[PDB]
Write a structure and sequence with these properties.
This is part of a larger assembly, with eight copies of chain A and one copy of chain C (79 residues). Chain A has one helix at 11-15; one strand at residues 33-35. Chain A is rod-shaped, with a radius of gyration of 25 Å. Chain A is built from one helix and one strand, in the order αβ. In chain A, 35% of the residues are buried. By secondary structure, chain C is of the alpha+beta class. Chain C has one domain: Small outer capsid protein Soc (Outer Surface Protein A, domain 3). Chain C is built from two helices and six strands. Chain C has a four-stranded mixed sheet with strand order 4-1-3-5. In chain C, strands 2-6 form a two-stranded antiparallel ribbon. The chains are: A little secondary structure (51), C alpha+beta (79). At the E-F interface, strand 1 of E face strand 1 and helix 1 of F. Chain C: One of its GO terms (cellular component) is viral capsid, decoration.
Chain lengths: 51, 51, 79, 50, 51, 51, 51, 51, 51
């Protein structure tokens, strides 16, 4: 009666592949890295430049 | 001041440069500050309105 | 605390023999300990994971020989 | 009988009101801690008096 | 109320020139920026019925 | 999701020399602004927190 | 090892209906012979341990 | 001073990619699976088969 | 109505194993939403009625 088992649903147990069942999987694939936006400038029409 | 032990493995695992990530966020941070500066002096140097 | 997960085995008692039972026992196990050692099959149970231990009998990260004696105790036949 | 398996996920940066994630390996399953009332993407308003 | 206003300014070219131990000066480090890279993990849950 | 348990990273740009630290400000944060003088006078002298 | 921290699996062939269990005899083990009636009489009746 | 950090050398902290430094890596990758060898038969020349 | 006594059937989609029974809920009901864990977690345990 081989049980497939699940991860604990814990965040650590998954990242390790640790599984209550028989098999311990490799790892949690990758769905890709999310970065944070780079914010916008007000430009300079508000103030004279004069390099 | 990033680290030499980092760029080796971070390039191995994530493929990112770990340099152009810092040079990207410093050169961007000096601009986002020099832009938030000349907005701050507008708000700083402005008379109180509705007065 | 276990800090990871709790696999919760609830055995359901039954009449094995004349005027005898296999006592159903609510028990909880720290998930890493559970995946390492569990003897439960054919034991008339049902299991679910939970972030906190869902039964009053709790086994933390480190017991081992204390737990190894508890799971095989799920088969204890009492009258 | 039928069986399906899906699973749900939460957008990292969901909260975005916090400069740091906790624990740095953090379940993306919606839970009371991370996902309850904390998504910055969804803003809910109970309208009364209709 | 205008009591406590909000500014952004520069760095005097006398201080910025010698910065972090030049010309005998000391105790005045530069400011730095890092990056972080933390991860998340999800799990698949099941569902099912009968007739 | 092809294999169970996806995962997704997140790159926080964190400044102050400690990418992972207690209460280390995030760099480009849509909510919170860039600290106006950080590159600037903020690096030359330490300004007293307002309490 | 190209990327840090390789990992190696191991597949134990375990018999007794519970792949992961306390003292679950491994199936094909160079040390230990197979219990010669497991398939056989040992499944029909239970033989008492020797103590 | 962005530090690369290490896995704790703990067995879980590697398989989860948890890392004391900035970056939490993907995971261990794989070095391949190790199975257990099947034992050898003595064949039948020692006992008359006689189907 | 071409002949006395018409008749009209009605197919209730009723769930819970008893096509006819006491208060067995109808499946696709314009009023009542489908109980969203019935297939799901709701079949693993019985959630305590709220009273």
């Amino acid at each position: 009666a081989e049980i497939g088992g699940d991860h604990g649903y814990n965040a650590t147990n998954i990242a390790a592949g640790q599984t209550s069942g028989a098999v311990t999987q490799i790892g949690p694939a990758v769905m890709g890295m999310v970065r944070r936006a780079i914010p916008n400038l007000i430009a300079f029409d508000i103030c004279g430049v004069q390099p | 001041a990033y680290s030499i032990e980092l760029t080796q493995d971070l390039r191995a695992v994530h493929g990112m440069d770990a340099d152009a990530e810092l040079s990207g966020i410093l050169a961007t941070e000096i601009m986002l500050e020099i832009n938030r500066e000349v907005v701050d002096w507008i708000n700083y140097s402005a008379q109180v309105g509705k007065s | 605390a276990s800090a990871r997960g709790y696999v919760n085995i609830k055995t359901f008692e039954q009449k094995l023999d004349g005027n005898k039972k296999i006592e159903g026992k609510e028990v909880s196990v720290a998930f890493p300990l559970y995946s390492d050692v569990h003897k439960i099959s054919g034991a008339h149970y049902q299991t679910f994971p939970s972030e906190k231990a869902a039964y009053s009998t709790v086994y933390e990260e480190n017991q081992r020989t204390e737990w190894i004696a508890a799971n095989e105790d799920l088969w204890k036949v009492t009258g | 009988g039928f069986k399906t398996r899906y699973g749900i996920g939460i957008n990292p940066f969901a909260e975005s009101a916090a400069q740091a994630p906790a624990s740095r390996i953090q379940s993306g399953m919606p839970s009371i801690l991370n996902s309850l009332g904390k998504n910055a993407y969804f803003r809910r308003v109970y309208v009364k008096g209709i | 109320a205008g009591a406590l206003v909000e500014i952004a300014e520069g760095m005097a070219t006398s201080i910025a020139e010698l910065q972090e131990g030049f010309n005998g000066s000391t105790d005045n480090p530069w400011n730095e920026m890092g990056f972080r890279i933390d991860k998340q993990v999800i799990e698949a849950k099941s569902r099912q019925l009968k007739a | 999701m092809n294999s169970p348990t996806g995962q997704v990273f997140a790159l926080r740009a964190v400044y102050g020399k400690d990418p992972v630290a207690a209460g280390a400000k995030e760099a480009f944060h849509p909510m919170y602004g860039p600290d106006a003088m950080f590159s600037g006078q903020g690096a030359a002298k330490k300004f007293p927190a307002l309490a």
